[PDB]
mmCIF file with all atom_site columns, C-alpha atoms and ligand atoms in Angstrom:
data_model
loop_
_atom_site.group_PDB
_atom_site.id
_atom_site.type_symbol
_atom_site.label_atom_id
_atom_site.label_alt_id
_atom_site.label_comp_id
_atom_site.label_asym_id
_atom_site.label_entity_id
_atom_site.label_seq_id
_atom_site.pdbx_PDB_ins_code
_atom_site.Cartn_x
_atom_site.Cartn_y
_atom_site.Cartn_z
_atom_site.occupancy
_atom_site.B_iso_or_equiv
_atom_site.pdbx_formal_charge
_atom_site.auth_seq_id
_atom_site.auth_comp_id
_atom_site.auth_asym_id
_atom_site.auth_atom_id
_atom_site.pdbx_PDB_model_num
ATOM   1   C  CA  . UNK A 1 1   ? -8.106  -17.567 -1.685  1.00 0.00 ? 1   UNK A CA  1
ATOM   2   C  CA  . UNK A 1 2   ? -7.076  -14.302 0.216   1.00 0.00 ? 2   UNK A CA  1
ATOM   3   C  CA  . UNK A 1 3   ? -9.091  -13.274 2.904   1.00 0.00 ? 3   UNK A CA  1
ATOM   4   C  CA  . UNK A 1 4   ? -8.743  -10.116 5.239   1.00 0.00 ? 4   UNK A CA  1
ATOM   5   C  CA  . UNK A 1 5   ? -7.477  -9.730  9.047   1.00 0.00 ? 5   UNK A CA  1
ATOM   6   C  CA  . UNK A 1 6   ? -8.232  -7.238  11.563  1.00 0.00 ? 6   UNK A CA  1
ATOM   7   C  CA  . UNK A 1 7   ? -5.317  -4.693  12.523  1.00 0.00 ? 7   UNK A CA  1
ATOM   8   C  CA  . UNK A 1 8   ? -4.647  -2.083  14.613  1.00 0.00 ? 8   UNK A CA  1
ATOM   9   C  CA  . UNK A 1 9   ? -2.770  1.408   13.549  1.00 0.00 ? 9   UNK A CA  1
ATOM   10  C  CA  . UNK A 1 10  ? 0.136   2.147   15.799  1.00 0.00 ? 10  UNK A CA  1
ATOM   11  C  CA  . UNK A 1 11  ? 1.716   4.858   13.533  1.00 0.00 ? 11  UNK A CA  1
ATOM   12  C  CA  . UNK A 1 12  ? 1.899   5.614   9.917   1.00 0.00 ? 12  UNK A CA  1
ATOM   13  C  CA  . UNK A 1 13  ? 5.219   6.320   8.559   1.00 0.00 ? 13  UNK A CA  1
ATOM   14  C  CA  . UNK A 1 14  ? 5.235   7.564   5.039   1.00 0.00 ? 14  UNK A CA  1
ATOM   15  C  CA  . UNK A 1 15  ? 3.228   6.504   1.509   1.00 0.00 ? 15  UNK A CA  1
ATOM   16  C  CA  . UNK A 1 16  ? 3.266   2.912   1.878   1.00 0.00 ? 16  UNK A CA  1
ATOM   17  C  CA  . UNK A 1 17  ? 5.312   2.048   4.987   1.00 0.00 ? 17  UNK A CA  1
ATOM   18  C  CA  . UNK A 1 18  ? 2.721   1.503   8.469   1.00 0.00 ? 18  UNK A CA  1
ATOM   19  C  CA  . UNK A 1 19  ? 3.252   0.910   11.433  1.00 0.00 ? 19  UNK A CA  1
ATOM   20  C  CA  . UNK A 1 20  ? 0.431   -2.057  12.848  1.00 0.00 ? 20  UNK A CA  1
ATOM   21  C  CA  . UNK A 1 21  ? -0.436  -4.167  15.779  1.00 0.00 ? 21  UNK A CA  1
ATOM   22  C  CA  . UNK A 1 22  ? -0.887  -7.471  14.513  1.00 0.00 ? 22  UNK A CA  1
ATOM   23  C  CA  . UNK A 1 23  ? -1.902  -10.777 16.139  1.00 0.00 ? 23  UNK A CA  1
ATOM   24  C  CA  . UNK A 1 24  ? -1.284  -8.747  19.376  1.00 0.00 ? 24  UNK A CA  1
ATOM   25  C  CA  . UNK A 1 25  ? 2.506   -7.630  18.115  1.00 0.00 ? 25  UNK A CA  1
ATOM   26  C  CA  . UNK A 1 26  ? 3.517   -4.658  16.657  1.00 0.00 ? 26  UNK A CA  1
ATOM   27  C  CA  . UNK A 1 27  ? 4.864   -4.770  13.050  1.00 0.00 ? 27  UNK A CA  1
ATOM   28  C  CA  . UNK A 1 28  ? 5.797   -2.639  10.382  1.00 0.00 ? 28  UNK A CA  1
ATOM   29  C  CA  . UNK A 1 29  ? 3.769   -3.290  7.052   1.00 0.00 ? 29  UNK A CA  1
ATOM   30  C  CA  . UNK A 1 30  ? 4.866   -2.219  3.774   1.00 0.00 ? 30  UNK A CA  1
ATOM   31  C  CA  . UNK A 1 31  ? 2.076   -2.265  0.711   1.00 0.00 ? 31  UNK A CA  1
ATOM   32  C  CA  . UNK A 1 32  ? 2.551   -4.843  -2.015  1.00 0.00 ? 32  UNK A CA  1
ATOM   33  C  CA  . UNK A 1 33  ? 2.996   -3.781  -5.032  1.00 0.00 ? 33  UNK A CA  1
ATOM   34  C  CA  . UNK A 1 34  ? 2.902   -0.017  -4.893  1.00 0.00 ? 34  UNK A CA  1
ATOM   35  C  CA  . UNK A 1 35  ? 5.558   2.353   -4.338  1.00 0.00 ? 35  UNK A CA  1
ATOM   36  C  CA  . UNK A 1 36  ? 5.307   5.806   -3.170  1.00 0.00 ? 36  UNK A CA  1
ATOM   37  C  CA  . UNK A 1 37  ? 8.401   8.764   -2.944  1.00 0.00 ? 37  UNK A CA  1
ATOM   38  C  CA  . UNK A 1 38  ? 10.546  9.247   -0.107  1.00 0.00 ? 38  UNK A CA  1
ATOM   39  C  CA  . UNK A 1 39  ? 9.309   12.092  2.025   1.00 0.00 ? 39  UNK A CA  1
ATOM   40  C  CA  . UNK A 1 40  ? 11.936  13.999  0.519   1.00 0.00 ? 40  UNK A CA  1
ATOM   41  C  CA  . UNK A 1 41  ? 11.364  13.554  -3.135  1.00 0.00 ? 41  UNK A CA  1
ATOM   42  C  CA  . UNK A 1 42  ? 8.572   15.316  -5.118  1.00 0.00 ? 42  UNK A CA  1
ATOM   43  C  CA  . UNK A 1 43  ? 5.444   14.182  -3.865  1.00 0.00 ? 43  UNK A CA  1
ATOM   44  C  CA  . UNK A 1 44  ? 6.411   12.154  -1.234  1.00 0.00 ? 44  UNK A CA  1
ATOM   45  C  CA  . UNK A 1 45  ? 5.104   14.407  1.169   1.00 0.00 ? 45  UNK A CA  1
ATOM   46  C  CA  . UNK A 1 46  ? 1.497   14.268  -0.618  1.00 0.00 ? 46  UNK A CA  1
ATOM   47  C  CA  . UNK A 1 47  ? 1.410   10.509  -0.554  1.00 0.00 ? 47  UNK A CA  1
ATOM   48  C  CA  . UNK A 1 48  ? 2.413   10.528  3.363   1.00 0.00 ? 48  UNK A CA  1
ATOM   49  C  CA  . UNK A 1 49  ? -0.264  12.933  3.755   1.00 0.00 ? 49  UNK A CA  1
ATOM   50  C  CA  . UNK A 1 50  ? -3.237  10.713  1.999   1.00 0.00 ? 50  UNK A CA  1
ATOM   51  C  CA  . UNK A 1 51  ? -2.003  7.399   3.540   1.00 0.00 ? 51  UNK A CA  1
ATOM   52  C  CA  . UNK A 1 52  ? -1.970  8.924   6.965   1.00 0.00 ? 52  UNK A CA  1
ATOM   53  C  CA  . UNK A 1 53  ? -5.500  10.465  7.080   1.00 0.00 ? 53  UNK A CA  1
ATOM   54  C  CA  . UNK A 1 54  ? -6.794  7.294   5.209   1.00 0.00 ? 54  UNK A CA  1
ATOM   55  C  CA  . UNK A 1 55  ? -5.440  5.430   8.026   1.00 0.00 ? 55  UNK A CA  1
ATOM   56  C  CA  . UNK A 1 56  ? -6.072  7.861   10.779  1.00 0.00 ? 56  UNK A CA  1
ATOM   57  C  CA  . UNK A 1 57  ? -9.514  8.587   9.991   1.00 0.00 ? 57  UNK A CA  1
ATOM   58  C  CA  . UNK A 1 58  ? -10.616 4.803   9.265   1.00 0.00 ? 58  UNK A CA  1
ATOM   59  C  CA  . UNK A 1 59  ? -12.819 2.769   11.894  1.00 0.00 ? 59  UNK A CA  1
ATOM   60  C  CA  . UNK A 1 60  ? -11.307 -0.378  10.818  1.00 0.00 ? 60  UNK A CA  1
ATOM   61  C  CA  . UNK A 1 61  ? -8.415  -1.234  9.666   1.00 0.00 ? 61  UNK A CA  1
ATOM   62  C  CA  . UNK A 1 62  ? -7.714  -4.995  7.782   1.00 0.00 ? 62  UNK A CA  1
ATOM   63  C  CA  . UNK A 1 63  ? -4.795  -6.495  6.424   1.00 0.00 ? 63  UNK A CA  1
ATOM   64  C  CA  . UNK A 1 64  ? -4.555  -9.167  3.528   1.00 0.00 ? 64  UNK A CA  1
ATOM   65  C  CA  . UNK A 1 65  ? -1.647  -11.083 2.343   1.00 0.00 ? 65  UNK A CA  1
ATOM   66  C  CA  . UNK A 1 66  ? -1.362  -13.003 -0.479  1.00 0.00 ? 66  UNK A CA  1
ATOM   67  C  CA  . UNK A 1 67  ? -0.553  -16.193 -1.646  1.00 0.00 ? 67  UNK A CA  1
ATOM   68  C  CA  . UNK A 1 68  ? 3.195   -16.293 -1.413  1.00 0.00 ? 68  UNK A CA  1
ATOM   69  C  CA  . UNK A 1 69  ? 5.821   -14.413 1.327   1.00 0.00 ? 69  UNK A CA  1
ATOM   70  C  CA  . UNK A 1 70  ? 4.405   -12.549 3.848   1.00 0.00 ? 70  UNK A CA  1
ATOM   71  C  CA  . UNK A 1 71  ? 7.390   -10.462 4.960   1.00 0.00 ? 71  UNK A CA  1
ATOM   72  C  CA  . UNK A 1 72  ? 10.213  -9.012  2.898   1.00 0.00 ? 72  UNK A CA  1
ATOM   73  C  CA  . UNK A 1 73  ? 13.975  -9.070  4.047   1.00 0.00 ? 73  UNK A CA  1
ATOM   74  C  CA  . UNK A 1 74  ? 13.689  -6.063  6.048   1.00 0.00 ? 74  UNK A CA  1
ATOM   75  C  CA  . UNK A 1 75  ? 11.147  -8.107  8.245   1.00 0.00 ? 75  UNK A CA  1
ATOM   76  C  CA  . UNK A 1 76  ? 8.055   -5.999  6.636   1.00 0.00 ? 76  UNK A CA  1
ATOM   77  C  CA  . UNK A 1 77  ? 4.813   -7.670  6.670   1.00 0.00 ? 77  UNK A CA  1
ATOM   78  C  CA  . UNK A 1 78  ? 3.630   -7.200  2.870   1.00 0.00 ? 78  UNK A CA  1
ATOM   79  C  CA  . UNK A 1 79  ? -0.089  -6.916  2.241   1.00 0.00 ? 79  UNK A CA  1
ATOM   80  C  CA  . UNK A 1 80  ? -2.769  -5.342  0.613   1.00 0.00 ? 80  UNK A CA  1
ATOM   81  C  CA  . UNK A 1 81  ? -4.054  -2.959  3.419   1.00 0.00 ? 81  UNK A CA  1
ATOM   82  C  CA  . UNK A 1 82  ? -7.555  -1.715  3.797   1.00 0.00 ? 82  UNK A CA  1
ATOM   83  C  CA  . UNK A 1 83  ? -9.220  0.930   5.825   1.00 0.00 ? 83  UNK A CA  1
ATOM   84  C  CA  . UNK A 1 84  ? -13.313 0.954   5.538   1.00 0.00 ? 84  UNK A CA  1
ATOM   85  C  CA  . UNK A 1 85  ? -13.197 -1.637  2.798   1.00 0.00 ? 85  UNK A CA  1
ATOM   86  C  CA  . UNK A 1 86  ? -10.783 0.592   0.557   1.00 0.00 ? 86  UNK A CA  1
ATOM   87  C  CA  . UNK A 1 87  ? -7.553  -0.133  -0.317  1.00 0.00 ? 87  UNK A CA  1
ATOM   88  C  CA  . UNK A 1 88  ? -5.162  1.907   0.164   1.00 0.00 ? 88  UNK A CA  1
ATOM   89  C  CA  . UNK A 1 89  ? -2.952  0.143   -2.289  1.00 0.00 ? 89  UNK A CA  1
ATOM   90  C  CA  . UNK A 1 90  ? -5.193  1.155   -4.616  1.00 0.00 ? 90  UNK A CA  1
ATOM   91  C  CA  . UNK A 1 91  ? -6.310  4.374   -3.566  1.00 0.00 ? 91  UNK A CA  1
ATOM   92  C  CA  . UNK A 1 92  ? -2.909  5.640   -3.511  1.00 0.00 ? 92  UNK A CA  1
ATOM   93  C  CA  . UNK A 1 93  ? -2.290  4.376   -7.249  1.00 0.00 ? 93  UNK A CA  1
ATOM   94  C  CA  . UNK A 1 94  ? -5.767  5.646   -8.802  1.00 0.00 ? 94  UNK A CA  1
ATOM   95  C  CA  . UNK A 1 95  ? -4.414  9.446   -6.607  1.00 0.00 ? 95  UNK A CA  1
ATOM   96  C  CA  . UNK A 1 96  ? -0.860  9.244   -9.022  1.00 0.00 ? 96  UNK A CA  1
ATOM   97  C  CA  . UNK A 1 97  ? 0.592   9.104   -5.608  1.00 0.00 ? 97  UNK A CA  1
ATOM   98  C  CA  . UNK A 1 98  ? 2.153   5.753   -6.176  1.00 0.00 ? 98  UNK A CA  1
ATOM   99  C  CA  . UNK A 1 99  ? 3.358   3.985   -9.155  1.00 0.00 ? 99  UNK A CA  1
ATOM   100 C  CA  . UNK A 1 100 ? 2.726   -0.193  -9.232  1.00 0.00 ? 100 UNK A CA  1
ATOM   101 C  CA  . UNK A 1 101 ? 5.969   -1.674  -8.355  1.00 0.00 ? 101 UNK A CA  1
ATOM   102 C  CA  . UNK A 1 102 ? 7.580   -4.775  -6.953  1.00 0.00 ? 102 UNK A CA  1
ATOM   103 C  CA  . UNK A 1 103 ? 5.321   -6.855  -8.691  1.00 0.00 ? 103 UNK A CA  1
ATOM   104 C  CA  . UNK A 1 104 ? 6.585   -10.292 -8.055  1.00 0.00 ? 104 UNK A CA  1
ATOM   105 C  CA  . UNK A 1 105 ? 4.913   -13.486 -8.826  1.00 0.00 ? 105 UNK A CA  1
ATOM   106 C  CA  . UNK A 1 106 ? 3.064   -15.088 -6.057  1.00 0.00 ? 106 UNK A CA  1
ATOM   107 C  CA  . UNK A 1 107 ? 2.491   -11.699 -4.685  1.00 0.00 ? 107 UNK A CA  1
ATOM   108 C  CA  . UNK A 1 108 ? 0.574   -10.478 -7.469  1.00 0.00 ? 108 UNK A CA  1
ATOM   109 C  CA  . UNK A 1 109 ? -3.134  -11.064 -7.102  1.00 0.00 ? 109 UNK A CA  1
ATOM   110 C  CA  . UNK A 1 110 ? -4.615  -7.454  -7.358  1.00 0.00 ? 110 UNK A CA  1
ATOM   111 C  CA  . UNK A 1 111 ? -1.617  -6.528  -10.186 1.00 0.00 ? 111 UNK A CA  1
ATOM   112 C  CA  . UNK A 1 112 ? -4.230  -5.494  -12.720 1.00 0.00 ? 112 UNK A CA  1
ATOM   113 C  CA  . UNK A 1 113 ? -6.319  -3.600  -10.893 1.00 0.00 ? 113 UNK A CA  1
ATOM   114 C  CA  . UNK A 1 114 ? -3.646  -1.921  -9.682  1.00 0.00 ? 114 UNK A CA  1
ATOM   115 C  CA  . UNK A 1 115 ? -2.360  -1.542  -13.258 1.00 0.00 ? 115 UNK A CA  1
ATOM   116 C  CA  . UNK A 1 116 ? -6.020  -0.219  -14.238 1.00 0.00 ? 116 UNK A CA  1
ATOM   117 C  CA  . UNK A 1 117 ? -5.910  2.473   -11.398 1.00 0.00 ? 117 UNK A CA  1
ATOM   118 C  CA  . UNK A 1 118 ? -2.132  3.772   -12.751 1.00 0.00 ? 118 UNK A CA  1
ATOM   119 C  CA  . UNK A 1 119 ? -3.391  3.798   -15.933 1.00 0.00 ? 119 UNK A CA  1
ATOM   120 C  CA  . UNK A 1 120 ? -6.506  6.300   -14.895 1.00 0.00 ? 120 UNK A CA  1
ATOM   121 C  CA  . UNK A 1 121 ? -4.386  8.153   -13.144 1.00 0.00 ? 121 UNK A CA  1
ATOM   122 C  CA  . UNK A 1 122 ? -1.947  8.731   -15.883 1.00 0.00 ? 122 UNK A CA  1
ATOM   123 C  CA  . UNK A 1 123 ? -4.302  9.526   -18.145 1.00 0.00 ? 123 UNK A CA  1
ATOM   124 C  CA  . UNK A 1 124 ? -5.646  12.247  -15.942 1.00 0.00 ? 124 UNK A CA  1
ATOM   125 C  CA  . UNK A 1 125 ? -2.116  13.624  -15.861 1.00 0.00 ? 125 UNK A CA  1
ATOM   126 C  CA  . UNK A 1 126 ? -2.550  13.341  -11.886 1.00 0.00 ? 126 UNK A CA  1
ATOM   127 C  CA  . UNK A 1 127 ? 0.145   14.532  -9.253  1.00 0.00 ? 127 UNK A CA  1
ATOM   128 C  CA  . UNK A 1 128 ? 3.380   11.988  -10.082 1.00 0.00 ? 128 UNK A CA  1
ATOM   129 C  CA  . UNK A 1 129 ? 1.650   11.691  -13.961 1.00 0.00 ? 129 UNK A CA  1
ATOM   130 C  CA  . UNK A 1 130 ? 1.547   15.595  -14.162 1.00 0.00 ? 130 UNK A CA  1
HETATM 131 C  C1  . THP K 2 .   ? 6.863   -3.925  -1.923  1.00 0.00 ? 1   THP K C1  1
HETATM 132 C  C2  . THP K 2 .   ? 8.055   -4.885  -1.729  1.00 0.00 ? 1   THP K C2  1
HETATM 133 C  C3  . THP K 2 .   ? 9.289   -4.404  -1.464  1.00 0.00 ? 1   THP K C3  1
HETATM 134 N  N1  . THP K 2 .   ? 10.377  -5.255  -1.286  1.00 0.00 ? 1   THP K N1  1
HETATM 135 C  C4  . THP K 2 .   ? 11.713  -4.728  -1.003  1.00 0.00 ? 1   THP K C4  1
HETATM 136 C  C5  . THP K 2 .   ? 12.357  -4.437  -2.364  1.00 0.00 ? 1   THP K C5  1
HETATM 137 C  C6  . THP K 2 .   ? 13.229  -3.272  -2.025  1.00 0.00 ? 1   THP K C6  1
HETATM 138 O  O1  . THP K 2 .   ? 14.512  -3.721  -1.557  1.00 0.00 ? 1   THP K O1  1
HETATM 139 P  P1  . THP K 2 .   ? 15.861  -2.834  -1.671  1.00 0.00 ? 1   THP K P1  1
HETATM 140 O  O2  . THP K 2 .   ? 15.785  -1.704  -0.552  1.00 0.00 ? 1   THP K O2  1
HETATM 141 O  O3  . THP K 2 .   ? 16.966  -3.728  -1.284  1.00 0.00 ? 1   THP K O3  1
HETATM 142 O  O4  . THP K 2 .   ? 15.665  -2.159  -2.954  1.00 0.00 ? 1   THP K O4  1
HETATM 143 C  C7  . THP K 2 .   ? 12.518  -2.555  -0.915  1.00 0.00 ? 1   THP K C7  1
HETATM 144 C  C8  . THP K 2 .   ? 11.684  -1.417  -1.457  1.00 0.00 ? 1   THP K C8  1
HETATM 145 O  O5  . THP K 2 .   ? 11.047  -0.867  -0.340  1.00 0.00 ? 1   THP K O5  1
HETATM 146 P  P2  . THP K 2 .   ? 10.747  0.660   -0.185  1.00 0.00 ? 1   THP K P2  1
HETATM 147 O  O6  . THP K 2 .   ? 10.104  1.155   -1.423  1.00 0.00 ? 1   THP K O6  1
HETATM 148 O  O7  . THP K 2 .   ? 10.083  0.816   1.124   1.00 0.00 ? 1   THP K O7  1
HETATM 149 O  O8  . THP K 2 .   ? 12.202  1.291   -0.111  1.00 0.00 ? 1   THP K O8  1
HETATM 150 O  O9  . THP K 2 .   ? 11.636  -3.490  -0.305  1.00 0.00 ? 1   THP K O9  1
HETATM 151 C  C9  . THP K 2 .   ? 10.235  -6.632  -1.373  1.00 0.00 ? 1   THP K C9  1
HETATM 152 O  O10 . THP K 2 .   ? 11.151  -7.424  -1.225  1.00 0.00 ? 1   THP K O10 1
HETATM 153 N  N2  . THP K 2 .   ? 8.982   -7.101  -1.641  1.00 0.00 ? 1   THP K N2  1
HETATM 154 C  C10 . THP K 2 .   ? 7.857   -6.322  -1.832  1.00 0.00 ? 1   THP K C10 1
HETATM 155 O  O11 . THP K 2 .   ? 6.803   -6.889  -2.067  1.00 0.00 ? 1   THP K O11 1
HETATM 156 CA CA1 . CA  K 3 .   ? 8.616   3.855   -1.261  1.00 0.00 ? 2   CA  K CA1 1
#
C-alpha cells in the first residue's frame, strides 16, 4: 500500500516539474501521471502559476510513490505530490490545467481519479478544455 513522506520545497519549476529536498537531498520531482504545457505553450504559464502558489503557500508538503519505479530516466523522482492533504496531481487535472498522461502500469494507482477529475473538467469546458 502507498503511504506518504514528508518533503521540503526548494523551488518549483513549472506545472508538474518541483524542485524538493528529500531524505535530506535535493531532487527534482516530476508528477505521475499528469502533464501540464511548457511555459511557453498556451496555458503553461497558468498551470506554473497554480502549482507554484499550491506549493508555496502549503505548510506541509508530502510525497507518495507508487508501487513500481520511483524515478524516470531523466533521474526525476515520480510521485503523487501533496500539499495540505491535496494533491496537486489532482488539483491541477480537476483546474483543466493538466491532461492525465504517462499512465503506465505499476505507476497507476490514482489513474481513475485522475481520469474522473479530467473528465469534470472537460465537461466544464475549463482552461485547456475551453
Ligand atoms: C510522468 C512521467 C514522465 N516520464 C518521461 C516520459 C517523457 O520522456 P521523453 O522526454 O523522452 O518524452 C518525459 C515527459 O516529461 P515532461 O512532460 O516533463 O517533458 O518524462 C516517464 O518516464 N515516466 C513518468 O511517469
Ligand atoms: Ca509537461
Amino acid at each position: 500500500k502507498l503511504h506518504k513522506e514528508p518533503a521540503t520545497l526548494i523551488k518549483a519549476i513549472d506545472g508538474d516539474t518541483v524542485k524538493l529536498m528529500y531524505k535530506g537531498q535535493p531532487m527534482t520531482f516530476r508528477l505521475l501521471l499528469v502533464d501540464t504545457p511548457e511555459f511557453n505553450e498556451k496555458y503553461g504559464p497558468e498551470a506554473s502559476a497554480f502549482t507554484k502558489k499550491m506549493v508555496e503557500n502549503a505548510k506541509k508538503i508530502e510525497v507518495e510513490f507508487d508501487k513500481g519505479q520511483r524515478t524516470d530516466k531523466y533521474g526525476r523522482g515520480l510521485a503523487y505530490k501533496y500539499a495540505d492533504g491535496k494533491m496537486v496531481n489532482e488539483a491541477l487535472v480537476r483546474q483543466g490545467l493538466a491532461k492525465v498522461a504517462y499512465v503506465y502500469k505499476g505507476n497507476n494507482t490514482h489513474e481513475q481519479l485522475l481520469r474522473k477529475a479530467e473528465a469534470q473538467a472537460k465537461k466544464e469546458k475549463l482552461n485547456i478544455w475551453s
